[PDB]
Design a protein around this ligand. Structure first.
Ligand code: FE
Ligand code: FE
Ligand code: FE
Ligand code: FE
Ligand code: HG
Ligand code: HG
Ligand code: HG
Ligand code: HG
Ligand code: HG
Ligand code: HG
Ligand code: HG
Ligand code: HG
Ligand code: HG
Ligand code: HG
Ligand code: HG
Ligand code: HG
Ligand code: HG
Ligand code: HG
Lengths: 340, 340
């Protein structure tokens, strides 16, 4: 029941962010939430081209890196590549079919587009530091530790997409599909979308930042400067992306949008909390693999764990959740000079 | 059965453009088809911001225009706005769930993104020429003469999307849903995709170009010059978009990407031909409504009717279809000053 151009003349200012009438005319002279228009304008002002960044010396730096440092650097890069591969397509496939206001529709498409630029930058880096990129790219898919760290991301998007298709095809109700009873509940679909957004928020807010810390650890010793310039630019984009998710989530919580979403945000509060705790544990577990061949000065399992707890508390506080970790000061204040 | 990250390590150089394993890793160091990477590169190199175009004098030009000319200009602009509203979201929602090679996936997202910029440019123009943009935007959804084509375009996308959901959810076969038999055929889905792509090719290559003639006719008179600059940038992007659909269609019908698709194309060849003529006829009938109160310097019902046949022959020939109209040289070579 999805349509690329709804024929009903509706007041886009009164539609809910999600699950309302699909957007027909794309207009930007007015908006229900100006924050999304501001985010679009910001992201567009940040447009950058990866191939323009000089990465000619990163090859020399990487090649001369001790083996364990190569492992750390490349493992981190592979995870970043995984995230943006997923983030380039997922917002469009999973969220686009559910948006009912133009500013949010275009923000999602712009956001997704910016992630494809990130992916293009990783190819730019990879192709210029290793002889055979295929070894790196192929490993992203088969690496058990990389997929264990990311487990839950694609699966959540996939479930939401499947539930969305059932909704658009059959509508609300209890149906009989090939002899099996299938329930299509919009409230349940709203819950899935809501928790998906919270998961994406955690991906943006924590997963990416942990990886930035590892990238900039090399920038601190004046190595991989081409990669550093790129990660700085990517970080600037991710900051906008997480601002977008924090606002979507907090606006839904406010009850100023779909009233049902406000009820859902409250009822599912523990699930929100749980997914953050789970994501944090995954990031921590990754350290055992990251430093399997040795650590670096200022970058090891303990420092990584402290940073995960540090940033997780900040991000959870930002969306109204209790803090699961002991409070602490930034374990790696040097990261500030690289962010924003 | 769609996934945002297929867990199987596959050779992306050997997958078909569509219906293969969903793209997992986004890489750009290699490609099955170079054209899509080159198109991505070109499109990124053409990035532009509408707000940077001075449209301060279009206001007075528009007010000074005779009433029938205001109708011509605004009706045309409304149609362009409709086309890009649909094109900003549809390639993403309709094609992403079916693409199996990374270069094509990112091209589609880049292409769709470029369309959102176009939509933003129309808002820039409209808000600077009428005082109350709402009157213009609302008429787009309700305008009888416009919605004719709108529904026809949306239909192809909407049906493809619906059939794609059934395919991902139930797979091929004869299923039952609430007492009704629902048959899912990959062959029929492929035909749907082919028809849809041909329709988009006609939209990109014919519908847009007819509107460009309508727009640049004013530019020739040094009127609505801000609009002219924007449409010129839009036409530059559209040339890339049509290049992309022409390659997709030609690769699908030759049989080098998927034998079944080549077989289907030949099968529904007559349908495709009438599909194109129909689209041309619609643009013709439109030119009518456009001049139902008079003509202007350089454009009228007949000259526009001639341009439609001229461009249609060229575009249809490009994708292996017979020529429906008598051959002639360009009716308005002056338009070349503004096109690629
Ligand atoms: Fe990213
Ligand atoms: Fe992001
Ligand atoms: Fe366009
Ligand atoms: Fe286009
Ligand atoms: Hg999500
Ligand atoms: Hg998600
Ligand atoms: Hg890391
Ligand atoms: Hg780290
Ligand atoms: Hg829940
Ligand atoms: Hg919550
Ligand atoms: Hg810790
Ligand atoms: Hg299509
Ligand atoms: Hg289509
Ligand atoms: Hg026209
Ligand atoms: Hg025209
Ligand atoms: Hg056909
Ligand atoms: Hg056709
Ligand atoms: Hg004619």
């Amino acid at each position: 029941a999805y349509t690329t151009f709804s024929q009903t003349k509706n007041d886009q200012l009164k539609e809910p962010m999600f699950f309302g009438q699909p957007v027909n005319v794309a207009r930007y002279d007015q908006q229900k939430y100006d924050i999304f228009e501001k985010l679009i304008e910001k992201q567009l002002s940040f447009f950058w081209r990866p191939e323009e960044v000089d990465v000619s010396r990163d090859r020399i730096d990487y090649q001369a890196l001790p083996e364990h440092e190569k492992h750390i650097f490349i493992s981190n890069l592979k995870y970043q590549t995984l995230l943006d591969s997923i983030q380039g397509r997922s917002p469009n496939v999973a969220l686009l079919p559910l948006i009912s206001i133009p500013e949010l529709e275009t923000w999602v498409e712009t956001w997704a587009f910016s992630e494809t630029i990130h992916s293009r930058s990783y190819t730019h880096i990879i192709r210029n530091i290793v002889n055979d990129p295929s070894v790196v790219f192929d490993d992203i898919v088969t690496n058990e530790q990389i997929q264990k760290r990311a487990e839950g991301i694609s699966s959540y998007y996939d479930e939401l997409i499947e539930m969305t298709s059932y909704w658009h095809l059959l509508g609300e109700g209890t149906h009989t599909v090939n002899g099996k009873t299938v329930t299509v509940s919009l409230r349940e679909l709203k819950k899935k979308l809501y928790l998906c957004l919270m998961s994406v928020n955690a991906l943006e807010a924590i997963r990416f930042y942990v990886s930035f810390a590892c990238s900039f650890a090399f920038a601190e010793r004046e190595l991989m400067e081409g990669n550093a310039k790129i990660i700085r630019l990517i970080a600037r984009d991710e900051a906008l992306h997480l601002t977008g998710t924090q606002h979507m989530l907090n606006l839904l919580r406010s009850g100023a949008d779909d009233p049902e979403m406000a009820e859902i945000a409250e009822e599912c509060k523990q699930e929100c909390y749980d997914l953050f705790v789970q994501a944090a544990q995954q990031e921590k577990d990754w350290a055992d693999y990251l430093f399997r061949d040795g650590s670096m000065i200022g970058l090891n399992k303990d420092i990584l764990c402290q940073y995960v707890e540090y940033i997780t508390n900040i991000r959870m506080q930002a969306v109204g959740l209790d803090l699961p970790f002991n409070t602490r000061s930034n374990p790696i204040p040097w990261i500030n000079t690289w962010l924003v």
